Amino acid sequence: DAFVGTWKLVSSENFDDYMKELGVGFATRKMGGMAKPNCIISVNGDVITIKTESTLKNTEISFILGQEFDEVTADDRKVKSTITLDGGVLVQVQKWDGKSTTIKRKREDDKLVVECVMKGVTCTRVYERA
Ligand SMILES: O=C(O)C1=C(C(=O)Nc2sc3c(c2-c2nc(C4CC4)no2)CCCC3)CCOC1
């Protein structure tokens, strides 16, 4: 939809702090910190796919809005995830071990803006079309 495309990361703020707040170790935060992934969003029928592609690691999720799914994250958490569309924003929550984190994806002008929150840490990542 408004989201469908191939997106390339152009800016990131507070991502190391976000990863730290989630308990991610040094080696994975080192891989994530200066990675500039592509995010490939597609839709077919009920099913949305989001691929995150980067030199040292690729991940993918496919889901139906409102339907919880199991996800293995890039930092190897086993989480339960639910994604909904609220006011044009794709809102993802991941739940594990009594914890939660949100990843919100929105379109603003030419940007795909991704806000990641864990506790008191807010990270913002900005993608532009490839
Ligand atoms: O911008 C995005 O799509 C988002 C995320 C993302 O790109 N994460 C990447 S790309 C990447 C790596 C990680 C990574 N994340 C984590 C923890 C934070 C979750 N540990 O490693 C590690 C291996 C190299 C490539 C995560 C938050 O949701 C939005």
Side-chain angles (χ1 to χ4, degrees):
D1 47 12
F3 288 98
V4 167
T6 299
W7 300 92
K8 174 69 177 182
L9 187 76
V10 298
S11 69
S12 181
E13 287 129 43
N14 309 326
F15 189 49
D16 187 57
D17 290 340
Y18 174 72
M19 287 189 286
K20 197 155 198 58
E21 205 71 6
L22 296 165
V24 184
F26 177 92
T28 295
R29 294 205 323 286
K30 181 170 200 216
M31 280 203 273
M34 288 164 61
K36 305 287 260 213
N38 295 318
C39 179
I40 304 169
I41 302 175
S42 59
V43 184
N44 230 123
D46 289 325
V47 179
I48 302 168
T49 302
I50 303 176
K51 302 181 178 186
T52 308
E53 285 192 358
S54 81
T55 307
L56 302 177
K57 189 148 185 99
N58 303 305
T59 67
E60 184 176 307
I61 57 167
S62 289
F63 58 88
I64 292 169
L65 295 169
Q67 187 186 309
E68 189 166 70
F69 61 105
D70 293 308
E71 177 182 0
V72 178
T73 66
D75 56 311
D76 296 314
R77 289 173 287 121
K78 273 79 158 175
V79 308
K80 299 280 187 187
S81 286
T82 304
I83 305 176
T84 62
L85 190 54
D86 186 26
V89 178
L90 281 172
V91 180
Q92 174 174 18
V93 60
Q94 296 175 332
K95 299 175 50 178
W96 76 107
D97 289 339
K99 299 172 277 187
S100 65
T101 186
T102 61
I103 302 111
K104 298 181 180 163
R105 292 175 174 98
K106 68 169 187 208
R107 296 268 294 101
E108 179 184 301
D109 294 348
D110 284 332
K111 301 176 180 169
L112 174 72
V113 178
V114 184
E115 184 208 57
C116 305
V117 169
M118 178 60 173
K119 301 166 56 185
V121 178
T122 306
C123 155
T124 305
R125 286 166 69 82
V126 180
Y127 295 77
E128 289 184 11
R129 288 189 194 268

